[PDB]
């Protein structure tokens with residue numbers, strides 16, 4: 001009889017668990033199984049963290065699982081993030097994400113054995129870099145909030161611009177929860193640079209649209225480059241018609257992420273059980289203080305996975321454990337509607353037959369981004385000189 | 387009111403001689419009356435910890451959780467922080483895995499430990515390395531959550547003083563993969579400094595010292611210095627640790643376990659009584675386990691302001707804004723031959739006292755020992771003796787810290803004062819140029835009585 | 846520094862690597878035979 | 894006069910301003926509350 005191997009997963013509704021159990025049954029059929037037998041075991045996102053931890057130590061860890069999946073808590077608000085859940089496996093050394101858009105998981109210290117197959121908000125900045133090559137930009141302004149996503153996007157944008165090419169001008173920070181932000185628009189307007197790149201949440205982007213709207217700053221020359229949290233929800237009616245936006249392909253109902261997830265994990269199990277040793281996880285969380293000897297090795301097998309003929313496209317992991325070749329779609333607000341004006345496969349940006357409309361009523365992007373006069377010259381106090 | 391204060395004890399130590407405390411009943415001058423409830427625990431799994439916290443919380447309405455163990459795992463301590471995410475209870479660290487610091491924590495968490503952070507301990511280590519004239523040093527850090535402020539604290543500290551320090555290179559080692567591709571040895575072979583600061587955990591220090599023990603890393607010229615989170619418990623000593631490991635701690639030998647628990651109960655009860663004595667309005671007690679959406683509004687952060695400046699028995703037993711003690715009474719211990727942590731220094735908030743140990747640092751181990759005493763006289767042009775500045779207390783660059791043994795002639799009674807100054811001149815220059823070439827350790831001091839040799843009667 | 850290597854015993858006590866790790870010269874001369882040069886180049890190929 | 898010459902040799906406008914105190918790069922060495930810092934001078938050209 002083949003060895004019974006269990007696979008842990010954290011899903012939301014029951015339909016996703018049905019697609020998971022079906023994907024495991026297909027994984028035990030399309031793959032040659034001569035000594036192992038995959039088992040489907042998934043739970044639901046509990047509203048409390050203690051009951052969730054007990055559900056893992058009494059549903060997932062008690063079944064001796066090797067790989068654990070995670071998605072997103074089905075809640076309209078955000079108060080109890082599942083990040084501490086990722087610490088649970090940290091006590092037993094691998095969890096794969098599905099819709100985790102927060103870049104906090106990109107760190108290696110607090111998230112050692114953790115990998116995800118979804119491009120966060122930082123990868124979108126890479127696409128923004130392509131924008132800097134689409135119309136030849138140089139001076140850009142990054143306006144982010146004062147938290148971890150702003151620092152991560154700042155270090156990522158600074159890391160991408162480390163050669164002798166363009167650089168960053170003045171990065172503005174603000175506390176998430178302050179509406180009176182007129183000084184940011186005054187200091188941002190006084191600066192010669194006009195390329196505005198906003199990367200915040202909804203309530204902040206609404207204040208940027210209101211404060212920036214009551215000062216007449218949406219005319220010609222002003223460019224607004226946002227992501228996805230600025231053109232969805234209540235921040236859509238306040239955004240100007242012609243703002244450059246983004247849209248992730250297959251945001252809701254990601255059955256391909258579950259099927260390809262069980263495919264990659266199944267390949268890592270069938271391929272992992274062909275070398276030596278291969279220890280077994282402990283039974284439950286009752287008197288198990290020792291760590292797992294097969295942790296970084298399992299993460300190495302999960303990272304070295306290639307699927308050029310996959311459903312989503314080309315599954316490939318980088319050196320940090322993210323999702324390479326992201327598939328986005330450059331959108332543009334036209335007549336109170338989101339009209340598709342571009343697509344991003346992963347390597348370059350492909351444009352369709354729709355012309356990009358600028359919020360300042362312009363249709364063609366000029367060569368020079370901004371030029372004028374009025375030079376400020378300061379000097380010290382010296383008797384023989386000045 | 388009688389507030390419940392539970393003390394969690396993890397380990398094989400008999401709690402019968404520990405729970406018996408006589409510092410109650412008569413020591414209840416405050417209007418609030420606490421009660422001690424100590425529990426035991428054998429295993430060190432998170433399921434039993436969360437189980438005893440939830441069952442003990444729903445069973446007894448406790449207010450101050452004092453967790454104390456004896457293992458050497460920091461991740462479990464992080465789990466304690468997770469408990470705060472579900473409780474926001476001022477958890478105090480006394481000894482064990484909960485005695486390790488963790489920089490950059492949650493602004494809403496209430497994780498407080500008696501041990502100081504890396505800013506104070508780093509300053510103590512730099513003071514020890516400054517008194518013994520240890521300029522060239524090395525830094526070995528790993529992937530521990532809290533190294534950016536460590537390296538930036540060391541650099542930002544050495545860039546301020548006028549002493550001619552020297553920094554070789556701050557390397558980094560990985561522990562997820564074993565040393566099988568020949569990289570850790572290649573990173574450690576470039577360290578030729580006499581003093582090396584280690585910043586990692588215990589299970590990582592066993593492997594770093596395991597490889598360094600094979601690759602000529604232990605004897606003289608490669609002295610390793612670890613803070614308090616590396617050694618942890620002074621009763622668990624393996625074998626791979628070499629002789630001569632400078633460590634620091636807090637009280638430990640002075641204040642035992644019942645003293646630390648009593649001080650923790652005094653801090654929790656005092657801080658819980660200042661709001662009732664000043665604001666005259668306190669909320670309810672803690673709720674059960676999953677009932678957090680209803681009691682999440684009753685939590686008040688004002689008590690945090692009462693967890694920074696705390697006084698007790700006159701001594702400055704307070705904390706800071708980062709969640710650690712501001713002015714600790716640290717104790718410096720050094721490993722000897724029989725593998726036992728013996729006290730060698732006493733650091734009081736500021737001043738450092740070296741009374742249990744003499745002036746000489748090493749003793750006898752393989753390699754050569756002793757040194758060479760050098761005495762001179764303040765001869766201008768050649769030997770220029772200058773007093774040490776009171777705003778520093780340490781000589782800089784080639785100025786040799788030349789001591790001075792004087793005796794206070796108090797009427798008909800003499801004493802023994804040692805005033806240290808800074809000597810510099812031609813003799814210091816030539817003796818240091820030839821001393822650097824021939825490579826040996828020496829000493830320098832002056833003469834206080836007898837001056838130049840002469841004839842007395844017939845001798 | 847003219848170093849000397851011993852081929853009687855295999856590199857099992859971590860000594861040949863310690864003697865060859867201190868060679869930071871742009872040109873190195875090898876004075877030995879063939880079966881010894883294959884082992885010196887075999888260990889040096891793994892060290893760097 | 895040099896600023897007037899450079900102002901007439903090139904078609905542009907300027908505005909001269911006097912700088913006050915702080916002519917040493919601002920070396921962060923005084924202990925100010927046990928916290929981090931950031932470069933805000935040294936070069937002295939980017940204030941705003």
Ligand SMILES: C[C@@H](CN1CCC(Cc2ccccc2)CC1)[C@@H](O)c1ccc(O)cc1
Pocket residue numbers: 084085086087088090091109110460461462464465467468469528529530531587
């Ligand atoms: C592994 C981490 C600690 N680790 C365990 C706890 C986890 C936080 C957590 C909170 C609540 C519930 C579950 C988990 C955070 C990560 C630490 O030991 C470490 C990091 C880096 C390093 O070189 C050495 C040690």
